Symmetry: C2
Subunit: 232 residues, 2 copies
C-alpha cells in the first residue's frame, strides 16, 4: 500500500517497508500490517484502514470478541518482539566493536583473498584455556574470514599484563611491516601457558588502555564471556 | 457501550469505566474512547469499533491523513499521561505513608469532632526553621484536620537525635494517657532552637528506627524536602 507508506513518510520522514498483511475477523475495514523501520530495522505491527489513511500501532492493549484476532495479534507481537530483541542485540554488538580504539584489534586478512571482506571478531583472554584452544583454530578461520582478534585483560591481572604486552608487541610488528604468520607467532608465544609473564617489564600506558578497553567491552553485559566470536 | 466493557471484562477480569467518546474524521466505524482502569485508576485511550467488539490501545504510533485526528490523539495521549503521572504519584505517596511503622506517626485528632476523618500528613524535621514555623500552625490545622505528624531525622545528626527523643517521649506520653496539648508541648519543647540536645541521653534503639524510617520516606525522591504536607 503506497498510501500508508506515504502517510507515514510525510509525518515522520521515514519510508517504511511493508512485510506482512493479514485480515481481521473482527473488522472489515481494518487490516493487520507489519512494517520495517528503515533506521532501526525494528518490525512494527499496525492496524491499518483499507485506504491506508489511518494507522494505529498494535500493542498488548488489544481486545476482541473474536479469539482468532486476539491470537493473531499475540503471535504477531511475540514474533516482532523476538526479532527486535535480536536486532537490538546486534546493534549493541556493532557499537561495542566500533568503540574499541582503532589500533587495538589485531586484524589478520584471510589467507584466501576472496574472503577478505568477511569479518570475524574474536574477543579473547590470553590466560583462558578455552581461548588458547580457540587460538589453535585461527589459521583455519583465516581460510574463511578476516579475523579481528580483540585481546582483553578480562580474567585477572596476568590477563591484563599479557594483553598489554601483546599491544606493545603488535605496535612494533606493524612498524616493521611484520607478516600475518609473525603476528600469529607473537600471539602463540604470549598465550603459551609457559610464557614467563613476570619475567617481562609491563608498559604502564598500555595496561591502562587494556583496562579501559576491556571494561567497555564487558560493561553492558551483552558480552558475558570469552572466547566470544561475532560475524560482523 | 456495554459491549466493550464486557469484552474487556471477560478477558481481563477488569470492569472498566467509560470516560470519553470522540469520533474520528478518519474512519466511520472507529471511535476514540478513554476508559478508567478500576485497579490503577489510570486513564487509558482506545480506538473502538461501533459494535464495541474490537478494541485497540492508542499510543504515539498513530498516523492519519487527517490532521485533526492526529491532533485529537496527541491531546488525548498528553492529557491521560498527565493524569496518570499524578495518580501514580499519589499512590507512591500513600505507599510511603503506609510503610511507616504504626507507632511512628504522632496522630493528633482535630479539635472539631466533625473533621476527625480528614487526614493531614506532615513530614517534619525538628532542626528545620521552616518546620518550626509550620509547627506554629498545628493548632489551626487541627480545627480542620486530624494531623499525622511524621518527625524525621533528615537534615543531620541533631535531627535524628531529636526525632529519637520525640519517639521516646511520645511512647511515655501515650503510656500515661497524655492529652493532645501535652503532645504538642512535647513537640514545641524539643523543636525549640534553645533545647539543649547534647544535654540529653539518646536512646540507641530509637535512633536506628528513626534512621531507617527516614531513609525509606526519602528514598524514592517522591518526597524531596520538608515540611511536606499531604492530604490523605
Amino acid at each position: 500500500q503506497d498510501n500508508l507508506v506515504s502517510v507515514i513518510e510525510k509525518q515522520t520522514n521515514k519510508k517504511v517497508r511493508i512485510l506482512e498483511i493479514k485480515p481481521l475477523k473482527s473488522s472489515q475495514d481494518l487490516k493487520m500490517v507489519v512494517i520495517e523501520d528503515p533506521d532501526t530495522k525494528y518490525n512494527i505491527p499496525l492496524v491499518v484502514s483499507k485506504d491506508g489513511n489511518l494507522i494505529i500501532g498494535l500493542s498488548n492493549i488489544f481486545f476482541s470478541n473474536k479469539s482468532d484476532d486476539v491470537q493473531l495479534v499475540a503471535e504477531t507481537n511475540q514474533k516482532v518482539q523476538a526479532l527486535n530483541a535480536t536486532q537490538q542485540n546486534s546493534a549493541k554488538l556493532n557499537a561495542i566493536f566500533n568503540e574499541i580504539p582503532a589500533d587495538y584489534a589485531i586484524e589478520l586478512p584471510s589467507t584466501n583473498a576472496a574472503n577478505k571482506d568477511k569479518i570475524l571478531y574474536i574477543v579473547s583472554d590470553p590466560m583462558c584455556p578455552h581461548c588458547q584452544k580457540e587460538l589453535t583454530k585461527l589459521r583455519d578461520h583465516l581460510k574463511e574470514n578476516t579475523v579481528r582478534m580483540v585481546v582483553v585483560g578480562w580474567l585477572g591481572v596476568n590477563s591484563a599484563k599479557k594483553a598489554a604486552l601483546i599491544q606493545e608487541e603488535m605496535a612494533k610488528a606493524r612498524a616493521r611491516g611484520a607478516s600475518v604468520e609473525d603476528k600469529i607467532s607473537i600471539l602463540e608465544k604470549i598465550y603459551s601457558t609457559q610464557y614467563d609473564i613476570n619475567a617481562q617489564k609491563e608498559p604502564e600506558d598500555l595496561r591502562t588502555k587494556v583496562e579501559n578497553t576491556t571494561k567497555k567491552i564487558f560493561e553492558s553485559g551483552v558480552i558475558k564471556g570469552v572466547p566470544f566470536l561475532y560475524h560482523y
